[PDB]
Amino acid sequence: GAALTEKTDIFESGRNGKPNKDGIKSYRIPALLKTDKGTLIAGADERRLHSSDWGDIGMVIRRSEDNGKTWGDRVTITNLRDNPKASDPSIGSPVNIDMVLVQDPETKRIFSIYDMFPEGKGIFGMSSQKEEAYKKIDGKTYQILYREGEKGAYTIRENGTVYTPDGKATDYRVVVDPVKPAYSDKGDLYKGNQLLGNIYFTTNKTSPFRIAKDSYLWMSYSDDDGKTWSAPQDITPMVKADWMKFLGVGPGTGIVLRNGPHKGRILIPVYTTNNVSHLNGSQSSRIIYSDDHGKTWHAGEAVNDNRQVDGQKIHSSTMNNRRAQNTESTVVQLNNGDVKLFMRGLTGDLQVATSKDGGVTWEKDIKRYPQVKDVYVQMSAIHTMHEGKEYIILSNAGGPKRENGMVHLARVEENGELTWLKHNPIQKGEFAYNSLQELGNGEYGILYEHTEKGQNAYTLSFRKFNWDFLSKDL
Template identity: 60%
Template structure:
């Protein structure tokens, strides 16, 4: 009986499991049908209609009929709603981003356009005779207008067009252009003879590819011109694997999906897509892929669609520093930008500082310190100015073993304004390394950087690699030998050259010998110690011009430090307490025992005399007693987990300094100083409700309605992934601790270093690292949000469904 009872019991349990599985599948199916695409499909689909006109009476698609008809009407309504002073066509998002405007429609819809746009519509006949130069002269903001007219010619001929921006590295090109050399087509197509659809699958893979331009219609896609030139003439498109990515890397395409296996689609599912070309008028200014992508949201809905409360503002991003694309440099010959630093000056000017990483994204190579100014809270930005960019070693190939190590380096800027002084001087403090790979190229054994003589510190020079006798650079750059005697050598230690690139040049008499910052293939008889240095530049004219850099390392270094560097972003000036007026800059250091492996420790450097002299405070880890009773010190520790690195300080109204630190615990850690940053309380507070992705973060303290708050901006992970930027609001409790109130998503995708500032009583601005898939690391973007955004819940539409139906997205999202 026991055995007999057991068997049916097992069967029942199995049936229960099977039933549960079917119920789960049914639930997931329901989730797919109720995918977030359903929730906000109208909003997303309206974007795609900016590029696709639906008007083919011979085709039917029951799934799309009613929705797409509504979309066409929606576009026309949006055109009619344009403000009278913005007759530019379709407004891109609520921020009125005018980088790119697209207008579409037949003759009827054209009649509804505002007069300036109507006058720009041309036919195939008069387009050939149109004077585009005259037409462009009438455009706002010096835009270039390209007209793709409605025509009686074949669709393939209508779509054989190119839209490109003057001076831009990006073009709009449809797949038909590639057929001249590669017969098989790619992208969205419809075989009109057989009434079959060619649907992208996987990584833009396709099946049943038709190579006849007479029977296929295409939808325009975005590419990079260089990629087109290099790939489509040299690589063939294999119909077997159908992988477009092997032909054109980084292509933006409607319908690009990642699926694990091929999915069968019904034959008439896409018949309502692009059957007839209409007139397109495109105004293009600095066209970039983000603009293009905004029109392809129908299939890219994983951008977080936020439902903002009334009065809340979260702006579209503005590219302040635009890097290159697809591993190539931008029009200014720059690979990318990193390490943002944002400062609001007392005159109301925004200063945006950055690393201009000319050759690559890593922490070495040809890197300059650059700045841009905005006098309208980031709406527009002035030209890029260089604070310093040291010259490359001409005797070292630019690419040495692929590591670009032939340059001295400046990097990791922090900006601060001395608001307590009469001059309101603005300081830029940053790292300096001699030629090499930055912190990786610091000597394995200590090399003394300075010699103390009569209370003065002089920079040491070495004349060979081993057991060198030490020379010194003294007043006016004159080199003294190891006996303290003058030599015929002198070094440029101060310069009026705009980019200060000749600093370190060494002469014998009037003959240039080389540069003391060169460590390899050098022609100079001298080099400085292979160490890290801290430099300072200043501006007395609101960031317009900058002084020659000054080395302040000698007063900051402590015996036992291997590396000392700046925690980039922004410093502060203390307002309360006995040290009011003190200038504070975040920094961190390592020791010789474990270096980057286990000794990184946050600390502050500070000045009490308006930047004339600088001092180093103790590290957070100095004499810190851990929960297990172990006592550590920054100069001797080897403890990976207890490291804290780049940081940002704020001062509370009670006088305390709170230091928000990058760390390895996975959560936010905050240290407290009660003496102006000279020492730290033993307890480091860990906030488990705030994720730390082990990347630099930024924070400010502010007041609203007589209450004290903290605004923190950082990447949200998961884990150590630098993605999904969040702005987090905390209220300061009476005891100085924080109560975290809201965590708001502000940027999808990559999100790394950032710098945040309060613009006024209601608004905040953040400058941050971000890249789209085609972009190099990184482009520095700027966004604005307000108090209403921070202080209320923002509902991310569809988040629950995205999590529950992620693997079913491709299967079900089309059936809306």
């Protein structure tokens, strides 16, 4: 008997453009993680001012200890404070946006990796010119601070003390070890004991310093099953190349390889843009990984690196080809050791890349599956076993637009090839980003974006379904 539970709203948006009960207009970008303890962690972007990809956005989660039946109160991981002097509040806050959750099965540490931008319009407000964000000194890497009127780079060193371009300590200090709830004090700039401003503010500044205007990657972790989180760690310098303009995560839930030469490796989907074509023709998927339980991260190569496009080779750092782009993605490892990267794209159908070396490089054959439509929106996919057989469950909008949620089932053969077996609707009406997780006992859960009755984009809801829903027809 087919079984699909009624939708349960986890993060409720307001309606008709009004704020919700907590004064928040929108929630977006779901992430669902089933931890070792059986806990379900639902993550999301808490977009207070509007539904756009910038503004005042906090990284939040809710925990369920009864497999999705009930949920605890919201837990904020990170939420930077707004620039109280910005002329336009809608774009007047440093930004955190798009999160990826994953747990190390050995250490049990839970990671939340997400984007960070200083005050502005996020990916839509990036400068045409690069600004160095870090400087190496005496074998040490320090984040840079810029002061109007001076060309030299100041640096943030031990204890947050600001040093002049010439290497002399100043009386300015940055809060590099935040202590306020949500770490809303991170980046605060002090002169002596007086708070002057914040290094993440870019307009109407009250302090002399700001970090480089660029795209960053931050990470927070929890060792207590999601109840409390560490202060944000800037992992950007570990993975961002000097040519990269944007570098952000493909939101959802990452994975840890289960088998092969790279078992234990944590994979985080991400994508970049270059300075040649940025968002018009350079969005390129890839993953970043960690082989030491999240201590250090490394960038793999882009699916587009040395890819053959129309008898011509391209590279993610120099490409300018709209149709060859691949953006947000979801990653899965097969029992044969191969890694599959399902990438959001502009071909109208499902695009999948394959890596034979734990996600570092990608094979030449980018497969397209007409069986699974892609309206250019995020998707999620997970590996699963059923009666000794290997499968992959993938969910995304069925179209025409971002609507009619579908859960696709594919059989995985020993060569890693896919055969799509079923396509079952799961949510009528508006449907966008989603995140799947296997719950066990033949059941699965999904946290997704949907709206109805005038709700603001989006309300994130949860549903559970079993194998009877996947295989049998409704």
